[PDB]
PDB file of C-alpha atoms in Angstrom:
ATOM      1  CA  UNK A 345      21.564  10.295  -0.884  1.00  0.00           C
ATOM      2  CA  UNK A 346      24.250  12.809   0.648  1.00  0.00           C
ATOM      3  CA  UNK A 347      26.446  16.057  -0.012  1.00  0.00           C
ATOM      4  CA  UNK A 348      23.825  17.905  -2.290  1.00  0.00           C
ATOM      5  CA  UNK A 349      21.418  20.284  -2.167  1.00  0.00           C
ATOM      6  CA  UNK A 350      17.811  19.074  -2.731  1.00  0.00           C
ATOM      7  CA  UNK A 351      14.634  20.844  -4.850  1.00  0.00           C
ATOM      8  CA  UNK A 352      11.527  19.423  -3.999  1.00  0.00           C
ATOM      9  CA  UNK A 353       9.437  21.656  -5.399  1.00  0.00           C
ATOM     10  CA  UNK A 354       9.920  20.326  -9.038  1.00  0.00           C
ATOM     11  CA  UNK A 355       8.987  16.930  -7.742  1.00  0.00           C
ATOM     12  CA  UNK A 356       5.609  17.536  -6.426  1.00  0.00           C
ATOM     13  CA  UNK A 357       4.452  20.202  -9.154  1.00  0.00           C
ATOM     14  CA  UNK A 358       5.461  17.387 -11.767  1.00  0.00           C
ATOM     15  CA  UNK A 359       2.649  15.881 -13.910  1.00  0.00           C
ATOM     16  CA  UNK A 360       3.272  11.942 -13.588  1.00  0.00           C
ATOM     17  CA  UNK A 361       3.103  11.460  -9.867  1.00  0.00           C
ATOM     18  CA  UNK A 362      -0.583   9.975  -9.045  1.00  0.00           C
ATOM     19  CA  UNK A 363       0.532  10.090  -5.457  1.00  0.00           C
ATOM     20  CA  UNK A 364       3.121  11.934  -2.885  1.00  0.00           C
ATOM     21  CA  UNK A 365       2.370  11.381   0.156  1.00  0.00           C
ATOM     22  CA  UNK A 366       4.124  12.453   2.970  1.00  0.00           C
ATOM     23  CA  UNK A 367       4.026  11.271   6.761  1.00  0.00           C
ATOM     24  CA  UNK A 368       5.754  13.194   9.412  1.00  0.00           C
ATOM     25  CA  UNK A 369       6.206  16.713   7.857  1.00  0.00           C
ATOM     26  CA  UNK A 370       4.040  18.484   4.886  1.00  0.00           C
ATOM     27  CA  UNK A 371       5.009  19.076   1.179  1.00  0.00           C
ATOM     28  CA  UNK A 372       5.442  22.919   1.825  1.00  0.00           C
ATOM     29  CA  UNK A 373       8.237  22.468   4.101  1.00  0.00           C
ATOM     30  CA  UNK A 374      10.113  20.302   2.056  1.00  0.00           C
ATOM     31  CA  UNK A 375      12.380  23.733   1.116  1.00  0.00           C
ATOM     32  CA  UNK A 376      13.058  24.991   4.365  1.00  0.00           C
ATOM     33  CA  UNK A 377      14.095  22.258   6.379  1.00  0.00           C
ATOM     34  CA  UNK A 378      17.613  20.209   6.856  1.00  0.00           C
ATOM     35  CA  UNK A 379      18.055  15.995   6.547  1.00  0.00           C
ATOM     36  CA  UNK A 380      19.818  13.676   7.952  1.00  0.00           C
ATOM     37  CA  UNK A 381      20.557  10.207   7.126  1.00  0.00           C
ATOM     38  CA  UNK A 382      18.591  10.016   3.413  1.00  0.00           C
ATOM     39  CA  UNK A 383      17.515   7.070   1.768  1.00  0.00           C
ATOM     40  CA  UNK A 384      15.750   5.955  -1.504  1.00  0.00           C
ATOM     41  CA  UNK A 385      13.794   3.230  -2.397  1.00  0.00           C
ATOM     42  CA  UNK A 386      12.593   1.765  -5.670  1.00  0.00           C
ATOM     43  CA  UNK A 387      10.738  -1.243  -6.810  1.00  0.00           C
ATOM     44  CA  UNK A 388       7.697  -1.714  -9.253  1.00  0.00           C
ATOM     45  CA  UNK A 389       4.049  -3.202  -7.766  1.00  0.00           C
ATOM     46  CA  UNK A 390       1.145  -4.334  -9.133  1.00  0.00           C
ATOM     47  CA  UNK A 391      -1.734  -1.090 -10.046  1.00  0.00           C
ATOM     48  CA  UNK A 392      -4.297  -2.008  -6.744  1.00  0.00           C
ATOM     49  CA  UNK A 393      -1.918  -2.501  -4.076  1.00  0.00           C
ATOM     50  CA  UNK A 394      -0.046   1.237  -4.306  1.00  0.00           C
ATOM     51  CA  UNK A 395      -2.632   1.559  -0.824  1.00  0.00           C
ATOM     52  CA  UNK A 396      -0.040  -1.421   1.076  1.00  0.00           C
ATOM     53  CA  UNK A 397       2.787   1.191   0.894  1.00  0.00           C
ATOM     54  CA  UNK A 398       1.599   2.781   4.345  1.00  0.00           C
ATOM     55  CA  UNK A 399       1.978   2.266   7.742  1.00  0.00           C
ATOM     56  CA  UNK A 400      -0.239  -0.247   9.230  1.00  0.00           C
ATOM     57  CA  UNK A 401      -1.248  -2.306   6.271  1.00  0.00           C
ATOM     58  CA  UNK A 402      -1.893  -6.197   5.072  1.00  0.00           C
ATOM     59  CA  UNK A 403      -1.985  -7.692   2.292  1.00  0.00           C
ATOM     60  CA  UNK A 404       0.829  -9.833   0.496  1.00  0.00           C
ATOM     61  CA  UNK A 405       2.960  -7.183  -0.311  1.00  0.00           C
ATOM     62  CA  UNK A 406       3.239  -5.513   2.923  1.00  0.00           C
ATOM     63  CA  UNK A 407       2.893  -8.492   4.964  1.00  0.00           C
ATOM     64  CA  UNK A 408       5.778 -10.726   2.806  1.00  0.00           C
ATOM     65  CA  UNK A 409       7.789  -8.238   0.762  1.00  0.00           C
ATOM     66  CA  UNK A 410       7.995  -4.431   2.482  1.00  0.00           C
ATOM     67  CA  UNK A 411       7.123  -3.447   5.294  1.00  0.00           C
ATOM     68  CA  UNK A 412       6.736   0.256   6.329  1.00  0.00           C
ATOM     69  CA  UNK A 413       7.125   1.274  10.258  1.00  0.00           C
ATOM     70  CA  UNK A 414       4.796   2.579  12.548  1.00  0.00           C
ATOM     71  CA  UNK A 415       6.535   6.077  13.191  1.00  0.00           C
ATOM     72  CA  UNK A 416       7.433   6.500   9.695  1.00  0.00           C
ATOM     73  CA  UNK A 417       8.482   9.663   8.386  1.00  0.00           C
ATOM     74  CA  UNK A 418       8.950  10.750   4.661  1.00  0.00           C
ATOM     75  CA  UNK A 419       7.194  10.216   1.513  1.00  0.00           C
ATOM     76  CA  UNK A 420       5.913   7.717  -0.981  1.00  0.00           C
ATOM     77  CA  UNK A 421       5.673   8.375  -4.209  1.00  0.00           C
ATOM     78  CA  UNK A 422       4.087   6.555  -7.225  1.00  0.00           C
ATOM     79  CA  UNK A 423       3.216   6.676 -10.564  1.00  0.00           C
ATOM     80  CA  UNK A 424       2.216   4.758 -14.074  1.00  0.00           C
ATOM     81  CA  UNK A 425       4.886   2.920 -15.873  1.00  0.00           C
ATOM     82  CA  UNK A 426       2.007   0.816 -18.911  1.00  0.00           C
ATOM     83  CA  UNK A 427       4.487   2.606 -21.548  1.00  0.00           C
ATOM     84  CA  UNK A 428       7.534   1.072 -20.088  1.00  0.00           C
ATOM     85  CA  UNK A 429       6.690  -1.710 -18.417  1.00  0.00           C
ATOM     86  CA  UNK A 430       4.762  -3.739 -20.569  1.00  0.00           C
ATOM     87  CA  UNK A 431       4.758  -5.189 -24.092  1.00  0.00           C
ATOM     88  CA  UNK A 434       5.182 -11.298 -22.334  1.00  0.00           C
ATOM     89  CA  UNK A 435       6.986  -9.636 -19.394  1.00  0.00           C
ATOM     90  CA  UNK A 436       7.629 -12.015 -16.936  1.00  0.00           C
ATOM     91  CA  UNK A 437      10.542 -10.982 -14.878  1.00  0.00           C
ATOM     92  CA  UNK A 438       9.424  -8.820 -12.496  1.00  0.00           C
ATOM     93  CA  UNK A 439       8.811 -10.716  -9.496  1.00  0.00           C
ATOM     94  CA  UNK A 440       6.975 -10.879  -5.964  1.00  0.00           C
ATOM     95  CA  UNK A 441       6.796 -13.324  -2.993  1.00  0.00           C
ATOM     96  CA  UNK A 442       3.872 -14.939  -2.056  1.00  0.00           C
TER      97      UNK A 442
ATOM     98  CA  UNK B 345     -22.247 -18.936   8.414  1.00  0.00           C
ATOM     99  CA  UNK B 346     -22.145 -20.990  11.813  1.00  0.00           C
ATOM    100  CA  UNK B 347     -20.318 -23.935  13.250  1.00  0.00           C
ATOM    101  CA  UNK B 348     -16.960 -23.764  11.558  1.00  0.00           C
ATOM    102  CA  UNK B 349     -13.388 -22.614  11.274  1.00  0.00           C
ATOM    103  CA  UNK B 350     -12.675 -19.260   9.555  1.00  0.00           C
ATOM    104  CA  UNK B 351      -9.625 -18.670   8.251  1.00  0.00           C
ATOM    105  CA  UNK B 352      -9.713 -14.689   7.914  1.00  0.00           C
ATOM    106  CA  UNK B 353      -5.913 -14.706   6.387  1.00  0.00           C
ATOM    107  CA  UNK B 354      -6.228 -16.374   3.065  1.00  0.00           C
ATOM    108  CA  UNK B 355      -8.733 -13.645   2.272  1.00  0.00           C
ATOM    109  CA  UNK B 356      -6.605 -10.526   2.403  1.00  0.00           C
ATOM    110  CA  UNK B 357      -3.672 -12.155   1.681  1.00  0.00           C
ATOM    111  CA  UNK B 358      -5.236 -12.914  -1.814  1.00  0.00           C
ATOM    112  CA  UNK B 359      -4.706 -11.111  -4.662  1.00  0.00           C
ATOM    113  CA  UNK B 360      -8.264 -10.132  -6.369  1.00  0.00           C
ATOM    114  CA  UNK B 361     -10.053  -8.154  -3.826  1.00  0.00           C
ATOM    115  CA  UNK B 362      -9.472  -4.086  -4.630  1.00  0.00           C
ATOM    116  CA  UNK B 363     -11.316  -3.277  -1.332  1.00  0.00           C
ATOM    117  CA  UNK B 364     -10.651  -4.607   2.150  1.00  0.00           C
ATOM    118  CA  UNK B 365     -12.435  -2.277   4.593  1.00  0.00           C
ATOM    119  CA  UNK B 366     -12.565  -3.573   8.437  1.00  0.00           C
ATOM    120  CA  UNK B 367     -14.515  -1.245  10.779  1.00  0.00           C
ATOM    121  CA  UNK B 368     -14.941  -2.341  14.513  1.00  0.00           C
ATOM    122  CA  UNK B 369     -12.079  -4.298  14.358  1.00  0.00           C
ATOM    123  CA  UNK B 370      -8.317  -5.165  12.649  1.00  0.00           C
ATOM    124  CA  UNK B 371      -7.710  -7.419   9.891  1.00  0.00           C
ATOM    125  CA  UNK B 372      -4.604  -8.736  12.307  1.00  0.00           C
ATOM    126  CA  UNK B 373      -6.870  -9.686  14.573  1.00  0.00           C
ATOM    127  CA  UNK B 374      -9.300 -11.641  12.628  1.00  0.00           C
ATOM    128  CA  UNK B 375      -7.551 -14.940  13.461  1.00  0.00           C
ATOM    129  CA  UNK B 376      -7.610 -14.403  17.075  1.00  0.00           C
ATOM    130  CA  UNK B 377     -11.162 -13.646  18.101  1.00  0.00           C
ATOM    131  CA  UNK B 378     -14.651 -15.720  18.309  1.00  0.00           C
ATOM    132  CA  UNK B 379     -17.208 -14.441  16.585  1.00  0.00           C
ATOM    133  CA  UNK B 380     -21.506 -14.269  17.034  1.00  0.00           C
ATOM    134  CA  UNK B 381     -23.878 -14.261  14.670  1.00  0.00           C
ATOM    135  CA  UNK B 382     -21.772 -14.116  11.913  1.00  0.00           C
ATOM    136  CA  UNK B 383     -24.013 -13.449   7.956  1.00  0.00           C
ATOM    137  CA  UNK B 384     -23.119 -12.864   4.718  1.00  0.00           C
ATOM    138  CA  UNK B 385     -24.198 -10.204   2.166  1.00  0.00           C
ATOM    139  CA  UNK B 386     -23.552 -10.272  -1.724  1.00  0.00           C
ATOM    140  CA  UNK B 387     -24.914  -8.084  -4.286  1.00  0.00           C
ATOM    141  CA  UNK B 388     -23.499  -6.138  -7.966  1.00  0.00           C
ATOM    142  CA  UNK B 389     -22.632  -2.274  -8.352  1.00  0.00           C
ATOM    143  CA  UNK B 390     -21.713  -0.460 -10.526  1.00  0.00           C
ATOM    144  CA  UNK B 391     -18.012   0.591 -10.200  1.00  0.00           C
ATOM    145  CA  UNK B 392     -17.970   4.035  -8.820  1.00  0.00           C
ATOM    146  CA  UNK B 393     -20.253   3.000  -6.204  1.00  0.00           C
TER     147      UNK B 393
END
């Protein structure tokens, strides 16, 4: 993500998001401050293991598939996908 | 539970359990300590307690 100019506000006062959380800086802030080197990442987990996402976690999705560092900072955000995710589907994958 | 080899990993890194809380101690470390007087306690709740 580069060359634009990011709103966060209409992210976090959104209706679908069932968590932001964010590590080295607070929501508020989002609008004021500058970023350098942005990246996004996406994949789809199973509905009790949205808690692995954080740093300093086990389990078989943080300890085989991502892993999150120590001095992390940004945010992870999640949310419900029943409607569009499911019917039978089988190919969404995970290592285990 | 006494007189045996615990293999701490196979636990967490299973897929059932919705609740893994350690409290003097780190799951990590689990597989690297000795432990005393080790029990065992199993009951039913309800499931917002």
């Amino acid at each position: 993500i580069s060359n634009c100019v990011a709103d966060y506000s209409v992210l976090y006062n959104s209706a679908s998001f069932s968590t932001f959380k964010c590590y080295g800086v607070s929501p508020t802030k989002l609008n004021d401050l500058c970023f350098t080197n942005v990246y996004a990442d996406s994949f789809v987990i199973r509905g009790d293991e949205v808690r692995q996402i954080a740093p300093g976690q086990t389990g078989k999705i943080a300890d085989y598939n991502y892993k999150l560092p120590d001095d992390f900072t940004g945010c992870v955000i999640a949310w419900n996908s029943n409607n569009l995710d499911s019917k039978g589907n089988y190919n969404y994958l995970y290592r285990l």
